[PDB]
């Protein structure tokens, strides 16, 4: 270990670690050649004038966790090479604008967790290099608009975990480089038409955990958006046109909203969207228009009044791996030939009354197929003939009187319980891979017993 002024440790290579040592002042006896100084988790409540006078070449300064309540206007004098400054978990109460004025090399400034309630209008002037700003977990009641206008180089900004309740037009207009913006866990109930104008480079917008009651038209001004979160809000409608401004959207988090309606074209023209999962939109009547949105890996539409699946779903979707259209009012089924990547299909809780031979023809990756809780009275004898690695088949609580075996010998799991008029018993030979079976009556387990968990138990359903 390199010889180093107590109680610090040095690593050679100009880094000095003096964290958790109970210091109440900047340590002394350290080389002026020091490049990084870690003095976090000490007891420095005040930084006096010229506190860093013998550290002119510091590039990284860590002050997190000191209960720092006062920084002298000239404490950070001379730190012209400082790139990273960490002040989280202190007692700052207001942004120390005067003290950080001359840090013209600063790229990263952490001011989170400081009980900050106000940020002076002149804050961040001189920070001509700032890339990353953290102001989260404070008590800001509004976006600090003029201070942020000083930061055209800014790439990452979090205003999360504060008390912001509305955002006015042009609040971020100068942040031309901004790539990621975190606004989550505020009380935002209002975003005006133009609050995001200027964020032409923005790729990630996090609005989760707020009180939005209407979908924000303002995201129309974000042509670079790739990831969007507005989960855990109070939005009830995603209207037609909602994402016309964001052709690059890959990810949309919309869950935990009282979402009850979506416009038929709300999700069209999203060539990069990889997943669309909407549950409980009880007022939707028509299957969404997905033209130009044909690279979904997962499609889930649940709890709607949809009664029909368009024929082109499987001629258009290119990489659809999972499809969940359970708990709707679907009666007829189109062909799923074309959906060659399709592995899991859920169609529980609809009104399907028959399965024709062609219904499942092309499905050579199909592993899981759930058709329980429908009204199926007839399944064509060759309905599963042309299947691949079908592993799991649930046709419980339907209206079967017979059940086809062809193509099903690879099943691990088969559910047949709740078909009260299903009389035939299965032969063990047709199902040598079976490990779990449910049937409507006890005598239908006798193959698999002496008279692999075969059970006639309704499961109380």
């Amino acid at each position: 270990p390199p010889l180093c002024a107590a109680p610090c440790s040095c690593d050679g290579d100009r880094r000095v670690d003096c964290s958790g040592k109970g210091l109440t002042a900047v340590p002394e006896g350290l080389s002026a050649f020091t490049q990084a100084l870690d003095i976090s988790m000490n007891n420095i409540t005040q930084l006096p004038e010229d506190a860093f006078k013998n550290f002119p070449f510091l590039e990284e300064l860590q002050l997190a966790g000191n209960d720092l309540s006062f920084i002298h206007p000239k404490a950070l004098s001379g730190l012209k090479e400082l790139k990273v400054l960490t002040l989280q978990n202190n007692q700052l109460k207001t942004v120390p604008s005067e003290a950080i004025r001359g840090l013209s090399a600063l790229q990263s400034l952490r001011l989170d967790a400081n009980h900050i309630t106000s940020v002076p209008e002149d804050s961040f002037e001189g920070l001509v290099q700032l890339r990353h700003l953290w102001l989260d977990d404070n008590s800001l009641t509004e976006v600090p608009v003029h201070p942020l206008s000083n930061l055209p180089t800014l790439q990452a900004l979090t205003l999360a975990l504060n008390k912001i309740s509305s955002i006015p037009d042009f609040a971020f207009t100068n942040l031309s480089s901004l790539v990621v913006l975190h606004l989550h866990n505020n009380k935002i109930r209002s975003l005006s038409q133009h609050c995001f104008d200027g964020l032409d480079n923005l790729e990630t917008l996090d609005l989760n955990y707020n009180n939005l009651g209407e979908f924000p038209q303002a995201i129309k001004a974000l042509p670079s958006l790739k990831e969007l979160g507005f989960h855990s809000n109070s939005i009830s409608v995603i209207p037609d046109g909602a994402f016309d401004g964001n052709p690059l959207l890959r990810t949309i988090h919309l869950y935990d909203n009282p979402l009850s309606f979506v416009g038929n074209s709300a999700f069209h023209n999203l060539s990069d969207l990889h997943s669309l999962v909407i549950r409980g939109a009880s007022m939707v009547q028509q299957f969404p228009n997905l033209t130009g949105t044909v690279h979904l890996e997962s499609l889930t539409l649940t709890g709607t009044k949809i009664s029909s699946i368009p024929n082109n779903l499987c001629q258009e979707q290119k990489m659809l791996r999972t499809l969940d259209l359970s708990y709707n009012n679907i009666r007829d089924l189109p062909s799923f030939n074309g959906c060659h990547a399709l592995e899991e299909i859920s169609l529980q809780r609809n009104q399907i009354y028959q399965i024709k031979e062609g219904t499942f023809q092309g499905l050579i990756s199909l592993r899981i197929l759930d058709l329980s809780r429908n009204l199926i009275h007839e399944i064509h004898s060759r309905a599963f003939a042309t299947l691949g690695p079908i592993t799991n088949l649930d046709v419980s609580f339907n209206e079967l009187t017979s059940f086809p075996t062809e193509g099903l010998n690879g099943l691990n799991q088969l559910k047949l319980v709740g078909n009260f008029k299903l009389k035939e018993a299965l032969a063990a030979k047709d199902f040598v891979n079976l490990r779990s079976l449910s049937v409507p009556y006890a005598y239908q387990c006798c193959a698999f017993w002496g008279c692999i968990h075969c059970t006639p138990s309704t499961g109380h359903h």
């Binding site: 976090s40 988790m41 966790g65 978990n89 890339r131 989260d136 977990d137 990452a156 975990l161 790539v179």
Partner: protein, 90 residues
């Protein structure tokens, strides 16, 4: 006897629940995961103030050394090119 800042521990899995003000980090260089409590997360992780508890979440960004969030890098591995929060061989 729990480490300082840890409300609930186990003999073999370290901390199960930290003081709400601290962040829990899972280490597994190991046989298993071992929970530890931190005031702030080390580089390679980011401080995540989640609804269930404060967590240190690992950076899983190709070629990244330190990050701002799951998809934005603040420092690339040495010799890599940093462009808009991503790291590139160039």
């Amino acid at each position: 006897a729990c480490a300082k800042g840890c409300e609930l521990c186990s003999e073999v899995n370290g901390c199960l629940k930290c003081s709400p003000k601290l962040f829990i980090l899972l280490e597994r260089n190991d046989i298993r995961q071992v929970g530890v409590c931190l005031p702030s997360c080390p580089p390679g992780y980011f401080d995540a103030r989640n609804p269930d508890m404060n967590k240190c979440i690992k950076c899983k960004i190709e070629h990244c050394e330190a990050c701002f969030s799951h998809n934005f890098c603040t420092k690339c591995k040495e010799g890599l090119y940093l462009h808009k929060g991503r790291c590139y061989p160039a």
